[PDB]
Design a protein around this ligand. Structure first.
Ligand SMILES: *CC(F)(F)OCC(F)(F)F
Ligand SMILES: *CC(F)(F)OCC(F)(F)F
Lengths: 168, 168, 168, 168
């Protein structure tokens, strides 16, 4: 590419992998959201919480793709695997799966940062530090807070209703 | 001091002690607030309640310091001891510790008032009666009200959540 | 902590130390401010300059504490030592002590950054670079500018009055 | 008087004396103000400072007279002695005389408070504490601040001009 400068093939490939990860995460949240929209689950605040996250993760993928083109890398898309579950259980079960998912995204961001440091790619470093790293830390904190409140409320049916009504 | 009039050394020293007490109280509320911000505690209304009190106590210290200078006394600062606990337990535990703290501040205000009366210092009397005594009485009443509601709600996890959501 | 990821015990402890440093700095500026409010010193612009800095340093401590909780670290508070002086001399003396204080905070920030780099903690790096490092550089520059103007003005009483009136 | 209750003859007489003192003080400030309006003195900010105080002291007398009637006491007016000087020297000389004057008013307020305490007259106590005691403390502090700045500026002609221009 005529514009490519200081952009390693290793980072280019890792950015493509991270896009697949973010799109996978968006798909997982789409599934979570619609599960809570089921007439036999029916927790609107939980559905909305996850649908909002689906959007956020899709936007993350799009930010990575824009950056890939800015650096003169080439987007390569792969199959997107279906979410790990078809049914997500209680709000607690779902929030547990969500924090696991966010930690995996966070670790992937940290790995990419490490790669960028190794390749002396300060533009990549800044990009991740600016658009991703703190967003992830904040989200994981919020999920931790929710998990604690969910667990304090477990009795169980009453707690799930109240959390959806009064927190979400 | 060129401006000093009817301002005893005993009151000057007691005012300095009271400043240390108010700053200690601010520090204790800072600790309480951040404890409730922990991801494994996560009671936002409780955190906000105590952070607001940290501010109020700091402002009290500043009011005392301004008055000290107005009277021609000299501010003398001492080490500030760390709060009595690192972890504050339940909302109930915390509110109990808070009312204990406020009663100690109140007693210190009353002792200073008594000292002012003994020294026939009506400006000091007015200062305390105007800026501190009723504020303390009102705060202690509010904490008493909270304690009663907390105790009525104790089961326990559900009660703590509901109090934070619906009162704080 | 359920949320903790890539957050070393070394950084957690250093963050706690830095909180103590910032609170110490706030206390030092509180003392500086009220000294200049003395009827026998009476430099209102100087008092306001330092009282504003007390607030800024307290806010820095609070930012560090919020971050500590975001990362799943645990705030640990220690005794706060009293400021190094009870009386602060001239505006020049005070500004000299202030720049010494800011340089020590700056060095502590740089040490923490180095620690973060060694622990490959890019979130910490970004946090410090975003909220602290440039604020410190700007503040130290402003103090340097003031010192130069103060020194140019030293005769002495006239210079101190004019600097307070026309710069502060 | 049909309305008189718990109002001693001693307090009634002391209130009349205090009125004479406040009117004397107003007259002294009138003289100070017009001295600084002299073409051979010509310090407008100083003239305005003292003319404002003349008004404040007259208003104090009027407040005391209103209170006297509220309590069913009887106003008794006496000759008003002329101010202690015809010419007031420098700004420094004048401010020195002003702080002496304010301290004498303050002492008179404190004596009246003591008298009220001895006569168990809480309405009088409140009246003085509310309308006079803190006003006096604040004024004396401000004069102390001015004296310090004046003295720092003394060379002499330049200092007097600058203080009038930049503080008053
Ligand atoms: C965000 C989600 F995965 F759901 O959607 C991805 C795509 F299919 F591209 F819309
Ligand atoms: C900022 C200062 F140190 F002054 O205050 C600290 C605390 F005591 F916590 F208010």
């Amino acid at each position: 590419s005529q514009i490519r400068q200081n952009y390693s093939t290793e980072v280019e490939a890792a950015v493509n992998r991270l896009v697949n990860l973010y799109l996978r995460a968006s798909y997982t949240y789409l599934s979570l959201g619609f599960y809570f929209d089921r007439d036999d689950v029916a927790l609107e605040g939980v559905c909305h919480f996850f649908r909002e996250l689906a959007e956020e993760k899709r936007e993350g993928a799009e930010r990575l793709l824009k950056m890939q083109n800015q650096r003169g890398g080439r987007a390569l898309f792969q199959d997107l695997q279906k979410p790990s579950q078809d049914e997500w259980g209680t709000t607690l079960d779902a929030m547990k799966a969500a924090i696991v998912l966010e930690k995996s995204l966070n670790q992937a961001l940290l790995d990419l940062h490490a790669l960028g440091s190794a390749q002396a790619d300060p533009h990549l470093c800044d990009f991740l530090e600016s658009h991703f790293l703190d967003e992830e830390v904040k989200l994981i904190k919020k999920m931790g807070d929710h998990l604690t409140n969910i667990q304090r409320l477990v009795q169980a049916g009453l707690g799930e209703y109240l959390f959806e009504r009064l927190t979400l």
